[PDB]
Design an enzyme around this catalytic site. Structure first.
Site, PDB file in Angstrom:
ATOM      1  N   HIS A   1      27.763  13.158  44.196  1.00  0.00           N
ATOM      2  CA  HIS A   1      29.133  13.676  44.205  1.00  0.00           C
ATOM      3  C   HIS A   1      30.183  12.608  44.013  1.00  0.00           C
ATOM      4  O   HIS A   1      31.162  12.712  43.260  1.00  0.00           O
ATOM      5  CB  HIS A   1      29.296  14.370  45.575  1.00  0.00           C
ATOM      6  CG  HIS A   1      30.678  14.849  45.906  1.00  0.00           C
ATOM      7  ND1 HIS A   1      31.166  16.021  45.424  1.00  0.00           N
ATOM      8  CD2 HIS A   1      31.667  14.291  46.662  1.00  0.00           C
ATOM      9  CE1 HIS A   1      32.407  16.219  45.861  1.00  0.00           C
ATOM     10  NE2 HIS A   1      32.740  15.176  46.624  1.00  0.00           N
TER      11      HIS A   1
ATOM     12  N   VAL B   1      40.704   7.220  49.487  1.00  0.00           N
ATOM     13  CA  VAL B   1      39.500   6.458  49.899  1.00  0.00           C
ATOM     14  C   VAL B   1      38.268   7.318  49.624  1.00  0.00           C
ATOM     15  O   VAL B   1      38.127   8.410  50.199  1.00  0.00           O
ATOM     16  CB  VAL B   1      39.535   6.113  51.385  1.00  0.00           C
ATOM     17  CG1 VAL B   1      38.234   5.417  51.838  1.00  0.00           C
ATOM     18  CG2 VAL B   1      40.707   5.162  51.691  1.00  0.00           C
ATOM     19  N   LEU B   2      37.432   6.848  48.723  1.00  0.00           N
ATOM     20  CA  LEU B   2      36.148   7.518  48.478  1.00  0.00           C
ATOM     21  C   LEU B   2      35.022   6.654  49.031  1.00  0.00           C
ATOM     22  O   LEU B   2      35.005   5.455  48.766  1.00  0.00           O
ATOM     23  CB  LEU B   2      35.942   7.650  46.951  1.00  0.00           C
ATOM     24  CG  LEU B   2      36.731   8.820  46.334  1.00  0.00           C
ATOM     25  CD1 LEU B   2      36.868   8.571  44.820  1.00  0.00           C
ATOM     26  CD2 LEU B   2      35.981  10.134  46.526  1.00  0.00           C
ATOM     27  N   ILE B   3      34.123   7.289  49.781  1.00  0.00           N
ATOM     28  CA  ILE B   3      32.969   6.528  50.286  1.00  0.00           C
ATOM     29  C   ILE B   3      31.699   7.256  49.846  1.00  0.00           C
ATOM     30  O   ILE B   3      31.617   8.473  50.054  1.00  0.00           O
ATOM     31  CB  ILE B   3      32.977   6.424  51.827  1.00  0.00           C
ATOM     32  CG1 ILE B   3      34.198   5.646  52.327  1.00  0.00           C
ATOM     33  CG2 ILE B   3      31.694   5.696  52.259  1.00  0.00           C
ATOM     34  CD1 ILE B   3      34.529   5.891  53.792  1.00  0.00           C
TER      35      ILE B   3
ATOM     36  N   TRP C   1      40.005  14.132  44.424  1.00  0.00           N
ATOM     37  CA  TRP C   1      39.948  15.043  43.279  1.00  0.00           C
ATOM     38  C   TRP C   1      41.331  15.582  42.885  1.00  0.00           C
ATOM     39  O   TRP C   1      41.611  15.726  41.693  1.00  0.00           O
ATOM     40  CB  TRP C   1      38.970  16.204  43.564  1.00  0.00           C
ATOM     41  CG  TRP C   1      38.905  17.176  42.417  1.00  0.00           C
ATOM     42  CD1 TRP C   1      39.597  18.344  42.275  1.00  0.00           C
ATOM     43  CD2 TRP C   1      38.082  17.066  41.251  1.00  0.00           C
ATOM     44  NE1 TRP C   1      39.284  18.969  41.073  1.00  0.00           N
ATOM     45  CE2 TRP C   1      38.362  18.186  40.432  1.00  0.00           C
ATOM     46  CE3 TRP C   1      37.164  16.089  40.808  1.00  0.00           C
ATOM     47  CZ2 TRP C   1      37.720  18.385  39.203  1.00  0.00           C
ATOM     48  CZ3 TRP C   1      36.545  16.308  39.582  1.00  0.00           C
ATOM     49  CH2 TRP C   1      36.829  17.449  38.802  1.00  0.00           C
TER      50      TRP C   1
ATOM     51  N   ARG D   1      38.851  -2.982  53.094  1.00  0.00           N
ATOM     52  CA  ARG D   1      39.880  -2.897  52.078  1.00  0.00           C
ATOM     53  C   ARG D   1      41.111  -2.100  52.509  1.00  0.00           C
ATOM     54  O   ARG D   1      42.033  -1.930  51.704  1.00  0.00           O
ATOM     55  CB  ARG D   1      39.277  -2.362  50.748  1.00  0.00           C
ATOM     56  CG  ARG D   1      38.281  -3.406  50.144  1.00  0.00           C
ATOM     57  CD  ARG D   1      37.299  -2.794  49.122  1.00  0.00           C
ATOM     58  NE  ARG D   1      36.353  -3.860  48.660  1.00  0.00           N
ATOM     59  CZ  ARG D   1      35.401  -4.410  49.391  1.00  0.00           C
ATOM     60  NH1 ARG D   1      35.162  -4.018  50.629  1.00  0.00           N
ATOM     61  NH2 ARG D   1      34.668  -5.373  48.817  1.00  0.00           N
TER      62      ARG D   1
END
Lengths: 154, 154, 154, 154, 154, 154, 154
Positions: D88, D80-82, D57, D127
Site C-alpha cells: 500500500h 508522514v507515510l510509514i 492520498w 525526520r
C-alpha cells in the site's frame, strides 16, 4: 469479423529513425539492421530520415519532431542502455520508454522501440547483431507492419 | 441507493480486440477464448473487429484508433509478455498497461486488460487456456459487463 | 492563519462508490463498511450511488463517469487486489492507483482510495472487516471529510 | 551570465500548507516546523493558509485548489507515510509525489515536498523534529526560496 | 426484530475525559485525538469535561466521580501504560481495566477504554497518533456511539 | 471545556499512610520518602496518620479503616513484595492491588499505590530510594494531587 | 511568561568568521556555506570579517580577538578535524571546543561551533556540503539567531 492487419512489404513507406550515439559501437549495428530491413522489404533508402542524438535521454524529443512530420509514416527509436553502478539506468530507461509510448498515443502514429535496455554489456552485444538477433531490424519490421496497418486503421 | 451494473448478455454489443503477434502460439489461444466468450454470451462474430499488431508495445496505439470508433462499445487488449534476461519486459509491460489505462480514461470507454505478464513460459501457458483459465475469455467477459454498464452510466 | 478543514458529519452529502467484483467475499465487506460509515455519520442511503465493475482495472473508467456528475460530492473507490504468482498485480495496482489519483486532480473532486493491495489473502482479510479494520469504512470517512472540506475550499 | 536566485527573507510572502492527519503526532511537529520557519524568516502567520486532509492520498487534490489561488505564492505539502505490511505504502507515496510534482508544473507554481516516506516509525520520528531535523521546516525554507525566485523568474 | 444502535453524530452530547499524566508525551496525543473526534463529529468542546490524574492507577476513582454526574453522557478513560522491569504493570493494568469496567456496570453508563497497555515504548508510540492510529480518537468514537445508543436503550 | 486538576501544594491536607513491616529495611525508606514529600510540599506532619501492619496482605483492611475517616483526605499504601520461590507473591500482590483499588471506588476517596512488586531484591532496592527513585515519595505526590483534585471534583 | 527569541533575518548584523586552513578542500565549502547563509538572510557581505588561521588549534585565540570587537555581533568558528592514527585529534578537538565555549561566556557574546570533528574523511565530506548538509551554513544560521536574540537579551 472485421480483420485489420499490416503486411510486411514496405513499398512507398517513409520512416524516421532516431538513433542515439552513446554505445555507438552497438547502436551502429542496430541502425544497419533497421536500414537493411527497410530496404530489403522494398522501402527506398531515400525515404528514410535518420536523426542522431547524443544519448537515449534525448531520443524522445527528437522522435516527437519526426513523428509530427506528415510525410513520415512511422518512427523507429534506436539506442543502447547498459546498467552502470548507480540507479541512473533505471531513470533513463523509464523516461525514454514512457516518452516514446506517450508520443505515439498523442500523435496517433506508430513509434517502435528498438532500444536495448541491458543489465550487462554481454546482453547488449547479444541483441545488437549477434546471438539474440538485431533489435534495430526487429523494430524496423514492426514499423513496416504498423505503417501498413495504419493505412486502413488510422 | 442508485445501483448501476452490467449484465453479461452481449446481444447487440460491438467489440474491438487488439492482439499482438509475439508469443502467438499463446496469444492465439487468448483470441479464441475472447471470441468464444463474446459469441456464446449472445454477441455476433460479425460485430467483432480484430486488429493484429507485432508486439505488446504496439497494442496501445492500435487500441487508441479502435476505441475512438463510435461503433465500438469496448476494446479488449490481448498479448503475452514473458520476462527475458534483461529488464526489457519491465519497460514494455509498464508502458502497455499505462497506455491502455490512460486511453480508457481519455476516451471514456472501457478497455479491458487481457495481456499476460508472466515471469516464466509455464505461467503464460497456465493462463492461456490451461490450468489457470484463459485471460482472453476473462478480458472479454469484463468488456461485455463494462459495455452493458456504460449503456446506463456513460 | 486561515484554516480549512472538513468535519465528519455527512448530512446532505452525496457519494459515489465504485466497487469491483473480483474477491467479492472481501469487497462486499468493504462496501458494507463504506455504506455504514456514510449512514451513521448522517448521510442518506438514497444519496449513495453504487457502480459495480468486474475488476480493479475497470474501477478508474467507471469512477471518471461518477466523478463527472455535478450531484456527486466525492467518489470512494473500493476493491481488493491480492498478489498472484506473476507480476500482474503490480501493473494492475499501479494503474488503478494512478488513474484514480489523476482523475481526482483532473476533475478537482475528492476520490478516496479504499482499494486493498495485499501480498497475501490473510492481509486482505485483515483489512476487510477484521483485525486491521475495514478499508471501505476508512475510505468513506475520508470522503466525508474531503467533501465537507471542498464546500469551502473548492 | 544572468543569475536568478531566491533569498530567504519571507516578508510579504503568502504560503499554503496542506497537512494530512494520519500519523498526526508526527505531522503536527512538521507543521510546527513549517510555521516557525516562515514566521522567523519574516513571513506573517496571517499570510499562511493551512488546509487539513485525512491522509497523504488526499494531499494532491487539496494542494491543487490552494496552488490555483492567485494570492498563494507557494504550497508546502506535509504528511508522514510509514511502510506497513503490504505494498500500500508504495502506491500512496508514488501517487502523492507524482501528483504534487505534476501540479507544480501544470500551475507553474512552486510546491515543496515536506512528506516523509519512511520504512520505519523510527525513521519518521528522526525526520519530524528530532535527530535528522524537521522536514516541515525544510520544505518551508524551500518554499520561501522558490517564492522569492519566482518574483523574478515567473 | 427490534434493533438498537448508536449513530456517530455527537450533537448535544456531553463527555467526560479522565487522562493520566504519566507518559504525558503520548497521553497528550490521545487527548488531542479524543477532543478532535468529538468536535468534528458535531460535539461542542464546551460540553467536554477533562479531569487530569497523576497515573493510570488513579483513573478509576476520578472516572467514578465523572460518571456519576447526571450531565455527563459517557466517560472516556485515557492513559498509557508501558511494561517496566517488574510485574508492576500487570497489577496496574489489571486494576485500571477492572475498575472502569465495574464502574460502567454499577453506574449503567458507557465508559470507554482509551488506555494503552503496551509491552514496549514503540508499541505505545504506534498507538498514540502514529502508525496504528490514535486510541484516544477510537475511545471517543466508541463513546459517541454508546451515548447515542443509550438515548434509546437506557 | 471544563478542566479539573490537582495542584501539588499540600497545605491543610490530611494523609493516612498504611505501611507493612515485612522487608522493613526497604519499606522504611518508602515511609521516609512519603513523609518528606508531604512535609516539603507544605503538609503538616501532625496531619499524617501512620498505621503499621505486618505484611502487604494486611494493608487493605487497615486502609479501609483509615479511608473511612472523614478527616483523612487520601490514603497512601506502602509496602514491598519480592517474588519468592513459590507463586505466593502472585496471590498476595493480586489481592493487595485489588483490595486497595476496590476500596478507593467504594469509599470514593483517593488511595495511592506505593507498593513495590518486584521480581528481585535488586529491583526493590532500586525503587526504595536508590537508582529508580522512591515509590513512597511518588505515591505521596500522587495523593497530594488527588486530594487537591477531589476538593473540586468530589 | 516573558519570551525571548531570535528571528532569522540578518539585516544590519555583523559577523566574524574564523576559519582554519587545514583540510581546506572541506573548510572552504563550510566558508562558502556560512557566507551564503548570511547574505541570503539579508546580512551584507561587507559586514563579514573573515580571519584565516593555520589549524583548528589556532581558531580560539583568533576568535577571542574578533569577539572582543564592539562592532562584531557574533563569531562563527569554522574548521575540519579528522581523526588520525594517534590521540592528537582528541586533544585538539577538546581544546578548540573548550576555548570557544569559554570565550563566549567570558565575553558574553555568541560564538557558534561550525567545526567538524569526524572519525573519518567520509564523515567530514558528508558534513561539508554533501549528504548531511553544510556545518558552516548551520553555524551561521545559529549565529544569526543568537545575534538577534542578544539585541534584547544582552
Amino acid at each position: 469479423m472485421q480483420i485489420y492487419e499490416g503486411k510486411l512489404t514496405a513499398e512507398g513507406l517513409r520512416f524516421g529513425i532516431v538513433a542515439s550515439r552513446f554505445n555507438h559501437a552497438l547502436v551502429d549495428r542496430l541502425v544497419e539492421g533497421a536500414i537493411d530491413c527497410i530496404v530489403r522489404h522494398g522501402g527506398r533508402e531515400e525515404d528514410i530520415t535518420l536523426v542522431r542524438v547524443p544519448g537515449s535521454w534525448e531520443i524522445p524529443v527528437a522522435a516527437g519532431e519526426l513523428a509530427r512530420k506528415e510525410d513520415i509514416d512511422a518512427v523507429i527509436a534506436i539506442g543502447v542502455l547498459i546498467r552502470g553502478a548507480t540507479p541512473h539506468f533505471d531513470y533513463i530507461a523509464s523516461e525514454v520508454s514512457k516518452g516514446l509510448a506517450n508520443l505515439s498515443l498523442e500523435l496517433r502514429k506508430p513509434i517502435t522501440f528498438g532500444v536495448i535496455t541491458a543489465d550487462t554489456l554481454e546482453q547488449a552485444i547479444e541483441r545488437a547483431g549477434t546471438k539474440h538477433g538485431n533489435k534495430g531490424w526487429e523494430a524496423a519490421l514492426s514499423a513496416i507492419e504498423m505503417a501498413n496497418l495504419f493505412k486502413s486503421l488510422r
